[PDB]
Design an enzyme around this catalytic site. Structure first.
Site, PDB file in Angstrom:
ATOM      1  N   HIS F 199      -9.104  42.491 102.693  1.00 17.73           N
ATOM      2  CA  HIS F 199     -10.386  43.130 102.410  1.00 17.73           C
ATOM      3  C   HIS F 199     -10.757  43.187 100.964  1.00 17.73           C
ATOM      4  CE1 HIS F 199     -10.336  44.486 106.733  1.00 17.73           C
ATOM      5  NE2 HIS F 199     -11.435  43.767 106.597  1.00 17.73           N
ATOM      6  N   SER F 203     -13.290  37.160 103.458  1.00 17.86           N
ATOM      7  CA  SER F 203     -12.770  35.908 103.966  1.00 17.86           C
ATOM      8  C   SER F 203     -13.140  34.659 103.187  1.00 17.86           C
ATOM      9  CB  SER F 203     -13.228  35.731 105.399  1.00 17.86           C
ATOM     10  OG  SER F 203     -12.462  36.557 106.292  1.00 17.86           O
ATOM     11  N   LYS F 225     -18.863  37.522 118.333  1.00 16.70           N
ATOM     12  CA  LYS F 225     -18.215  36.209 118.402  1.00 16.70           C
ATOM     13  C   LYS F 225     -16.718  36.384 118.623  1.00 16.70           C
ATOM     14  CE  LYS F 225     -17.280  32.486 115.036  1.00 16.70           C
ATOM     15  NZ  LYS F 225     -18.054  31.166 114.688  1.00 16.70           N
ATOM     16  N   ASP F 226     -16.165  37.547 118.234  1.00 15.35           N
ATOM     17  CA  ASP F 226     -14.733  37.789 118.497  1.00 15.35           C
ATOM     18  C   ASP F 226     -14.560  38.145 119.957  1.00 15.35           C
ATOM     19  OD1 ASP F 226     -14.190  37.316 115.910  1.00 15.35           O
ATOM     20  OD2 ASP F 226     -13.636  39.315 115.383  1.00 15.35           O
ATOM     21  N   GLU F 269      13.341  28.919 123.268  1.00 16.86           N
ATOM     22  CA  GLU F 269      12.012  28.803 123.836  1.00 16.86           C
ATOM     23  C   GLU F 269      11.191  27.855 122.917  1.00 16.86           C
ATOM     24  OE1 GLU F 269      11.792  30.399 127.466  1.00 16.86           O
ATOM     25  OE2 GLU F 269       9.881  30.569 126.440  1.00 16.86           O
TER      26      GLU F 269
HETATM   27  C1  HEM Z   1       0.831  39.802 113.407  1.00 23.40           C
HETATM   28  C2  HEM Z   1       0.351  38.585 113.130  1.00 23.40           C
HETATM   29  C3  HEM Z   1      -0.927  38.398 112.281  1.00 23.40           C
HETATM   30  C4  HEM Z   1      -2.059  39.102 112.354  1.00 23.40           C
HETATM   31  C5  HEM Z   1      -2.388  40.303 113.290  1.00 23.40           C
HETATM   32  C6  HEM Z   1      -2.979  38.552 111.380  1.00 23.40           C
HETATM   33  C7  HEM Z   1      -4.243  39.006 111.159  1.00 23.40           C
HETATM   34  C8  HEM Z   1      -5.219  38.395 110.416  1.00 23.40           C
HETATM   35  C9  HEM Z   1      -6.628  38.676 110.526  1.00 23.40           C
HETATM   36  C10 HEM Z   1      -7.242  39.676 111.505  1.00 23.40           C
HETATM   37  C11 HEM Z   1      -7.296  37.898 109.671  1.00 23.40           C
HETATM   38  C12 HEM Z   1      -8.821  37.903 109.513  1.00 23.40           C
HETATM   39  C13 HEM Z   1      -9.352  36.546 109.063  1.00 23.40           C
HETATM   40  C14 HEM Z   1      -9.366  35.672 110.257  1.00 23.40           C
HETATM   41  O1  HEM Z   1     -10.004  36.099 111.221  1.00 23.40           O
HETATM   42  O2  HEM Z   1      -8.735  34.593 110.253  1.00 23.40           O
HETATM   43  C15 HEM Z   1      -6.308  37.109 108.952  1.00 23.40           C
HETATM   44  C16 HEM Z   1      -6.534  36.187 107.961  1.00 23.40           C
HETATM   45  C17 HEM Z   1      -5.561  35.589 107.201  1.00 23.40           C
HETATM   46  N1  HEM Z   1      -4.235  35.615 107.549  1.00 23.40           N
HETATM   47 FE1  HEM Z   1      -3.392  36.600 109.094  1.00 23.40          FE
HETATM   48  N2  HEM Z   1      -2.388  37.511 110.732  1.00 23.40           N
HETATM   49  C18 HEM Z   1      -1.132  37.388 111.264  1.00 23.40           C
HETATM   50  C19 HEM Z   1      -0.267  36.448 110.887  1.00 23.40           C
HETATM   51  C20 HEM Z   1      -0.485  35.700 109.776  1.00 23.40           C
HETATM   52  C21 HEM Z   1       0.494  34.776 109.156  1.00 23.40           C
HETATM   53  C22 HEM Z   1       1.631  34.155 109.972  1.00 23.40           C
HETATM   54  C23 HEM Z   1      -0.160  34.169 108.164  1.00 23.40           C
HETATM   55  C24 HEM Z   1       0.329  33.004 107.311  1.00 23.40           C
HETATM   56  C25 HEM Z   1       1.458  33.069 106.641  1.00 23.40           C
HETATM   57  C26 HEM Z   1      -1.393  34.911 107.922  1.00 23.40           C
HETATM   58  C27 HEM Z   1      -2.166  34.716 106.799  1.00 23.40           C
HETATM   59  C28 HEM Z   1      -3.493  34.915 106.660  1.00 23.40           C
HETATM   60  C29 HEM Z   1      -4.356  34.436 105.574  1.00 23.40           C
HETATM   61  C30 HEM Z   1      -3.998  33.631 104.299  1.00 23.40           C
HETATM   62  C31 HEM Z   1      -5.714  34.871 105.939  1.00 23.40           C
HETATM   63  C32 HEM Z   1      -6.969  34.577 105.129  1.00 23.40           C
HETATM   64  C33 HEM Z   1      -7.764  33.598 105.963  1.00 23.40           C
HETATM   65  C34 HEM Z   1      -9.073  33.191 105.315  1.00 23.40           C
HETATM   66  O3  HEM Z   1      -9.680  34.028 104.596  1.00 23.40           O
HETATM   67  O4  HEM Z   1      -9.517  32.022 105.538  1.00 23.40           O
HETATM   68  N3  HEM Z   1      -1.557  35.863 108.913  1.00 23.40           N
HETATM   69  N4  HEM Z   1      -5.054  37.438 109.449  1.00 23.40           N
END
Ligand code: HEM
Ligand code: HEM
Ligand code: HEM
Ligand code: FES
Lengths: 147, 58, 241, 75, 70, 377
Positions: F199, F203, F225-226, F269
């Site tokens: 935040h 994004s 859209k979500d 798995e």
């Molecule tokens: C419990 C698992 C995870 C949850 C709940 C989560 C949640 C989120 C959410 C809600 C967003 C909002 C932006 C979007 O809708 O894409 C987001 C973006 C993002 N997440 Fe995650 N994520 C998880 C795992 C990961 C992991 C595995 C990575 C990578 C190492 C990651 C890295 C990022 C990054 C870099 C963004 C910025 C995306 C952008 O602005 O284009 N997250 N994440």
């Protein structure tokens, strides 16, 4: 879909291999002395079977239908005047009406405390009703079942 | 049909959020009755283990 | 040896999406189980009432249960007693501990039949293929009697036998029970002992496809409707001269 | 953080919009729509497609050699 | 057993077993079968040839079987 | 008014209502909510499962059967958990991939927390699979846990410490249960911090350009859209659980545990299969687990090897091909990982493993440099 998915989850907290209900236990009444409280397993629930010595039927032949909650008499319960089959539960909570130690008749329903008698009836307070007669029914005179 | 069905659906039932909510819930009931059974029914194009069909034999 | 064969694809009445499960067959398959299969195979995750709504009627199922016996609760001393099985006790271990299987069965341990259709690939097909199809041990292969020959079974050395030898029959409606029909039925019943939920699963699935098939377009039109202010939208750039 | 009204500085850009209740959610959907998906596919195949077929081929070859190896004629 | 239950498998198998792909496969079986017998200290054991035959046969079995079964 | 000022509403308002978002994000941004959804769906069916499951060896498997036959609707609950785990992994894999392709990793804190989130769900899921106490549950519990014994002078003690015994016995199941219960809550707090750091910048978008110049409120636009997005998750999930419950689990893991058997099979798995392939590609106890680990912690090196003057891949052809070769290579890896270590499979499993590391560590950064040069940058 919301209801359905929610309902399934909700309805999942109810049954299983838990519809058993076999029981109808083999009892025998001259087999047990004259008034000894005898609990069994009927679908689980402790079936408190106290027998009746003449003397103690007369305290049960003495009730009060005018001043009563669930109107009844010990005779109005039992089909064979001196053989009421009781249970152990307590219409309020879960204190199986302990043999003696109470007010009228004999019975006492602990948890906290509530007083019963030799018909299960609630004499004092806490339990709203007079236990549960499992149809109390027998086979012959001495022989007996339940339900 | 004529001064529009949707128009009346809007005017008589959708202008308020109340009636809106109210119809959706009333519409939820019937839909369930119609579909739950409808899908159970369509499913009957498998007159097989059809418990009803077996009920008669044994 | 790491050289083998995989089962073909039989056209069961319970394969291919929205598809019941032959219940008249589960019943014949139950018969097959109780008479020939149960002698050496346990199905300790299935009880008699499971057979109720499904194949048999309430009374019918109890009568079967009643028949033979189990070791019911403690006699008021400290020894147990016997009584006619109720609708609530699971089918009937022929061997106490695991080594009893070894003893009465060449030295091999016949695996449980509660699942099996889900515990072996191909499922009913593998069981079907293991059943019906049996062969003459080819040249250079040395059986040794305990182990029989079996195509499909890994290693080809089995310990079972073909207890399908066209019969040791049964019958309600009197199906001409050859080895084929007697095999299909076991597998069909086996599917059910492994996955009882099978029917209902596929029923919800039908409803899930019809609903998704109706919600999906609607939620899309909800979304494009709100996004339309943006998709249809115009820009102009009017900088100072 | 960030809000609206504190994002950035923008000058001289008009934006016409039309209310969602006055336009169609699916205008030329099949008309304009499909050509677009074809154009997007064209633009991307040569970068997406090849790596995958390289695996596709490695996969079927990989399996054949395996299966064909657990067999043998003389010696 | 001795004679009188019309095992459908056996019936459909005949027609099945016969057929081209299995004719050839069984040929190799027999071919290899006769080699294995024709020696002593050998080990090329004829196991593979059998499965290939069976496979070809069995696919055709599945396709034509259950149709008749009741 | 009320939404903006009230202490709790602010949070909601700042995260899902008035949050300025790029009017530009595509489907690949939906996995964010989808993971959020998967996380809750996995806690909710997970809790209901814990109301009937028992974590003791002699009843473990039996309790799971008890659920599917006797517990009302126990079966769907059970399969939704099972399949949601894979659904959680597909989404996890889309999400990581999305960020890699779009340069989203330039947000270090968010990303790094993401890696912690990746590890946490992997550790979580691994413990999940052991619970039914199936053949694969025990041997997968054995094979994987034993890796830690490659660590010098500490390893033996380590493996014996977490095992509870000298094997995967009684202590291990109850143990693994407790951590499988506690982990998703920790995951949640961490996802909040994930969202907290995110935040701080809002994004990224497909162009990698910058969208302050065209933001739209998160509300009609991305809530709706979500929603449509979660609906498709449900479809995939339900299509999987109703029609093919054992598809991704493969018909196998039934039949109880047997510490003397050892099935000619043994493979974790599907979601660990790529890592699995990398590990066995290396003849060496230490090196295998070293490269096993490195295959995932490498995500924490990606931002240090950005190299390109543009953030996204949208405008970079060579990089696209290289990216696709990464995904293509990851299929090979899982495919190999799901096969025995014999003739063909060893050498390609070996080659593909080197490629994985050559691609990320050398080929991708080089392409960035070349790309910069072609643009005279
Ligand atoms: C419990 C698992 C995870 C949850 C709940 C989560 C949640 C989120 C959410 C809600 C967003 C909002 C932006 C979007 O809708 O894409 C987001 C973006 C993002 N997440 Fe995650 N994520 C998880 C795992 C990961 C992991 C595995 C990575 C990578 C190492 C990651 C890295 C990022 C990054 C870099 C963004 C910025 C995306 C952008 O602005 O284009 N997250 N994440
Ligand atoms: C009542 C007589 C039977 C006996 C004594 C018996 C014994 C055995 C034995 C010893 C095995 C293990 C084979 C080995 O490990 O080499 C086995 C496996 C098996 N049994 Fe039987 N069996 C009998 C009947 C049946 C029947 C009637 C069925 C099903 C219709 C059946 C289903 C199976 C299956 C599907 C396997 C396969 C195990 C695998 O594929 O790994 N059994 N049985
Ligand atoms: C705190 C929340 C959770 C609870 C209370 C919980 C509970 C359980 C229980 C009781 C089991 C054993 C019963 C069974 O195998 O069906 C189980 C298995 C499993 N869990 Fe969870 N779980 C939770 C979260 C998660 C998370 C976030 C994941 C990751 C996706 C996960 C992955 C798995 C897997 C793959 C299995 C074995 C699959 C199966 O046999 O159905 N669980 N879980
Ligand atoms: S129920 Fe007996 S006193 Fe409370």
């Amino acid at each position: 879909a919301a209801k359905n998915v929610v309902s399934q989850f909700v309805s999942s907290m109810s049954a299983s291999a838990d519809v058993l209900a076999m029981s109808k236990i083999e009892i025998k009444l001259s087999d047990i002395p004259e008034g000894k409280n005898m609990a069994f397993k009927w679908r689980g629930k402790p079936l408190f079977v106290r027998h009746r010595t003449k003397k103690e039927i007369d305290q049960e032949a003495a009730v009060e239908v005018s001043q009563l909650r669930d109107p009844q008499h010990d005779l109005e319960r039992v089909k064979k005047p001196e053989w009421v089959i009781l249970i152990g539960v307590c219409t309020h909570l879960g204190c199986v009406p302990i043999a003696n130690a109470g007010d009228f008749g004999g019975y006492y329903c602990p948890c906290h405390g509530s007083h019963y008698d030799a018909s299960g009836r609630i004499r004092k307070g806490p339990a709203p009703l007079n236990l549960e007669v499992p149809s109390y029914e027998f086979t012959s005179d001495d022989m007996v079942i339940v339900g | 049909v004529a001064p529009t069905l949707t128009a009346r659906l809007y005017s008589l039932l959708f202008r308020r959020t109340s009636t809106f909510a109210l119809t959706i819930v009333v519409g939820a009931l019937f839909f369930e009755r119609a579909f739950d059974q409808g899908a159970d029914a369509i499913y009957e194009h498998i007159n097989e283990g059809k418990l009803w069909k077996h009920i008669k034999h044994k | 040896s790491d050289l083998e064969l995989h089962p073909p694809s039989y056209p069961w009445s319970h394969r291919g999406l929205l598809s019941s499960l032959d219940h008249t067959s589960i019943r014949r398959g139950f018969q097959v189980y109780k008479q020939v299969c149960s002698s050496c195979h346990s199905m300790d995750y299935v009880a008699y009432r499971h057979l109720v709504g499904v194949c048999y009627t309430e009374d019918e199922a109890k009568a079967l249960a009643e028949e033979v016996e189990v070791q019911d609760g403690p006699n008021e001393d400290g020894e147990m007693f016997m009584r006619p099985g109720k609708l609530s006790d699971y089918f009937p271990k022929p061997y106490p501990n695991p080594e009893a299987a070894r003893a009465a069965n060449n030295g091999a341990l016949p695996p449980d039949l509660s699942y099996i259709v889900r515990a072996r690939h191909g499922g009913e097909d593998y069981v079907f293929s293991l059943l019906t199809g049996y062969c003459e041990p080819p040249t250079g292969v040395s059986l040794r009697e305990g182990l029989y020959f079996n195509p499909y079974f890994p290693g080809q050395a089995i310990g079972m036998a073909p207890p399908i030898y066209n019969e040791v029959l049964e019958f309600d409606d009197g199906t001409p029970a050859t080895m084929s029909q007697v095999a299909k039925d076991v597998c069909t019943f086996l599917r059910w002992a492994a996955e009882p939920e099978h029917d209902h699963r596929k029923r919800m699935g039908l409803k899930m496809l019809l609903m998704m098939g109706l919600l999906l377009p609607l939620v899309y039109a909800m979304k494009r409707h709100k996004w339309s202010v943006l998709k249809s939208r115009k820009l102009a750039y009017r900088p100072p001269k | 953080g960030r809000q609206f009204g504190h994002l950035t500085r923008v000058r001289h850009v008009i934006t016409y919009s039309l209310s969602p209740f006055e336009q169609r959610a699916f205008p030329h959907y099949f008309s304009k729509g499909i050509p677009n998906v074809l154009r997007r596919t064209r633009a991307c195949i040569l970068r997406v497609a090849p790596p995958f077929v390289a695996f596709y081929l490695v996969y079927t070859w990989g399996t054949q050699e395996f299966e064909k190896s657990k067999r043998k004629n003389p010696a | 057993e001795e004679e009188e239950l019309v095992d459908p498998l056996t019936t459909v198998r005949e027609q099945c077993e016969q057929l081209e792909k299995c004719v050839k496969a069984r040929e190799r079986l027999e071919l290899c079968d006769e080699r294995v017998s024709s020696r002593s200290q050998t080990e090329e054991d004829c196991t593979e040839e059998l499965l290939d035959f069976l496979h070809a046969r069995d696919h055709c079995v599945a396709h034509k079987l259950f149709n008749s079964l009741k | 008014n009320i939404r903006k000022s009230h202490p709790l509403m602010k949070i909601v308002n700042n995260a899902f209502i008035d949050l300025p978002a790029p009017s530009n994000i595509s489907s690949w941004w939906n996995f964010g909510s989808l993971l959020g959804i998967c996380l809750i769906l996995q806690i909710l069916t997970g809790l209901f499962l814990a109301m009937h499951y028992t974590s003791d060896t002699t009843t473990a498997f039996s309790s799971v059967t008890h659920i599917c036959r006797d517990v009302n609707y126990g079966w769907i609950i059970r399969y939704m958990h099972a399949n949601g785990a894979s659904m959680f992994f597909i989404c996890l894999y889309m999400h990581v991939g999305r960020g890699l392709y779009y340069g989203s990793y330039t947000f270090l804190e968010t990303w790094n927390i993401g890696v912690i989130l990746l590890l946490t769900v992997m550790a979580t899921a691994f413990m999940g699979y052991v619970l039914p106490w199936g053949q694969m549950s025990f041997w997968g519990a054995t094979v994987i846990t034993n890796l830690l014994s490659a660590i010098p002078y500490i390893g033996t003690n380590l493996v014996e410490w977490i095992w509870g015994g000298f094997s995967v016995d009684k202590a291990t199941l109850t143990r693994f249960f407790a951590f499988h219960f506690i982990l998703p809550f920790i995951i949640m707090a961490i996802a909040m911090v994930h969202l907290l750091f995110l935040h701080e910048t809002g994004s990224n978008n497909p162009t990698g350009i910058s969208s302050d110049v065209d933001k739209i409120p998160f509300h009609p636009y991305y809530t709706i859209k979500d929603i449509l997005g979660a609906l498709l998750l449900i479809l995939a999930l339900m299509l999987l659980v109703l029609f093919a419950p054992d598809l991704l689990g493969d018909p196998d893991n039934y039949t109880p545990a047997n510490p003397l058997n050892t099935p000619p099979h043994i493979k974790p798995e599907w979601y660990f299969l790529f890592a699995y392939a990398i590990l066995r590609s290396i003849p060496n106890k230490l090196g295998g687990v070293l490269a096993l680990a490195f295959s995932i912690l490498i995500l924490a090196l990606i931002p240090l090897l950005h190299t390109s003057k543009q953030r996204s891949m949208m405008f970079r052809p060579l990089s696209q091909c290289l990216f696709w070769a990464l995904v293509a290579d990851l299929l090979t890896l899982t495919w190999i990982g799901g096969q025995p270590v014999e003739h063909p499979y060893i050498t390609i499993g070996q080659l593909a493993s080197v490629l994985y590391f050559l691609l990320i560590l050398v080929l991708m950064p080089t392409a960035g440099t070349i790309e910069n040069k072609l643009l005279k940058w």
